[PDB]
Amino acid sequence: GWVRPDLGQLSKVTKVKTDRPLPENPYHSRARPEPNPVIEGDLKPAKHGTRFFFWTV
Amino acid sequence: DGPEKNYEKTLAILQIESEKAELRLKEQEVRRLMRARGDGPWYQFPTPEKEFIDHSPKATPDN
């Protein structure tokens, strides 16, 4: 009773199961380095404006 | 007006310029450390974009 598959039945995903587990961390990836922290603050005017040479404001 | 005006205005100007000196030198050492080590917001030079990598299933397993 083996029926031939029709035109596009072998060209699609098919949802298997298994007793296996998921592989935890494929690629054997190391831990990611932590990014540099963000400066938390409500920003204010520059202290004495521009510290340039002699401009006051 | 008097001498108090000149005296205390001079004191104000002096604290202003002293603070400015302090902050200029502080900015120098800050830039030095940030450039020698990219711990800070500045001198963070660009890296390749992460979101344009394809993570989908490929044609071969050992991609």
What span, in angstroms and rounded, lies between the C-alpha atoms of A30 and B47? Answer: 19
The Cα A40–Cα B47 span in angstroms is 24
- Kindly report the number of other CB atoms within 10 A of residue A22's CB atom: 6
Rounded to a whole number, what is the distance in angstroms from the first to the last CA of chain A? Answer: 92
Chain B closest-CA separation from residue A53 CA (Å): 10
Structure-determination technique: cryo-EM
Whole-number CA gyration radius for chain A: 31
How far is the C-alpha of A55 from the C-alpha of B50, rounded, in Å? 44
Partners of residue B38 in chain A, C-beta under 8 Å: 36
Q: Find the closest chain B residue to A39 by CA distance.
A: B41
Residues in chain B with CB shorter than 8 Å from the CB of A36 are: 38-41, 44
